[PDB]
């Protein structure tokens, strides 16, 4: 019994350790969010299938690493879901062929937010998985340890919903004018979803975001967001109603708005946060 990764990295008979670099494409699913499917990354085979039956489990202690380490979740092992990090050894999966077959492990994260996310830097550790191999032949009891690393920069969604983009830049027409903000949201299943804006505002009504352009700034204007004409102030929750698998546009438009005094030539910039909530 031995195993290898998609890139050919091997752990031989008797167990050992290997680093597994994976391209992540996390996604929200119903009641759990996919972090990574390793069934395309890690493979094992039985070296003497005529004589011996090999048994493989996911051993307790298997857990997330890095920024994900505080997150509870589930692991799908050969189709069935089990708590993650593993606090008890999974059932055994039989290996009975010299042909390399997948180690059927997929890691999920339990939603703790509405549409939040956590940034994963490329090259960082995301999980350590302990594969335990036994058999019906002798008392062989071998540990194959897989250190799972992100091969790319992604953000893992931590909520029941996800967004079209985590960072959006729009460019207003030269003053005066407005521009649509492309921003949509969807949920794995129906959620009663709302959102609120956050940022530095210039007015009493907390509805005009300050111009913070550092170089050659204009005077007398800020940025004001509207939703089909309705002014959206900061820290005021807007309801999107029920949001399901079909993307829903937040319907936001950016505008210039007078903040007081002579309007002067120069650059305009406002940074505005969007945070989703359940209702």
């Amino acid at each position: 019994f031995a195993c290898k990764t998609a890139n050919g990295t091997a752990i031989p008979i008797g167990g050992g350790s290997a680093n597994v670099y994976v391209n992540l494409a996390p996604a929200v699913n119903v009641g759990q969010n996919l972090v990574v499917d390793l069934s395309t990354q890690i493979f094992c085979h039985n070296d003497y299938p005529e004589t011996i039956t090999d048994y493989v489990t996911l051993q307790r202690g298997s857990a997330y690493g890095g920024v994900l380490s505080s997150f509870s979740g589930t692991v799908k092992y050969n189709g069935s879901s089990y708590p993650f990090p593993t606090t008890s050894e999974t059932p055994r999966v039989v290996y009975n062929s010299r042909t390399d077959k997948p180690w059927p492990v997929a890691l999920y994260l339990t939603p703790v937010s509405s549409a939040g996310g956590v940034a994963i830097k490329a090259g960082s550790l995301i999980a350590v998985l302990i594969l335990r191999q036994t058999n019906n032949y002798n008392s062989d009891d071998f540990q194959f340890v897989w250190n799972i690393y992100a091969n790319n920069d992604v953000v893992v969604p931590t909520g029941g919903c996800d967004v079209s983009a985590r960072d959006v830049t729009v460019t207003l027409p030269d003053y005066p004018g407005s521009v649509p903000i492309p921003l949509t949201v969807y949920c794995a299943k129906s959620q009663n979803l709302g959102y609120y804006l956050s940022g530095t505002t210039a007015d009493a009504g907390n509805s005009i975001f300050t111009n913070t352009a550092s170089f050659s700034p204009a005077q007398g204007v800020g940025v004001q967001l509207t939703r089909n004409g309705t002014i959206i102030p900061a820290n005021n929750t807007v309801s999107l109603g029920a949001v399901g698998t079909s993307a829903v546009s937040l319907g936001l438009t950016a505008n210039y708005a007078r903040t007081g005094g002579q309007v002067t030539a120069g650059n305009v910039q406002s940074i505005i946060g969007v945070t989703f909530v359940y209702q």
Binding site: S113, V168, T264, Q269, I272
Partner: peptide, 14 residues
Amino acid sequence: ADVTITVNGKVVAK
């Protein structure tokens, strides 16, 4: 925040 919007614009004199 879950999302960060950057709004750029400019005032041109005339």
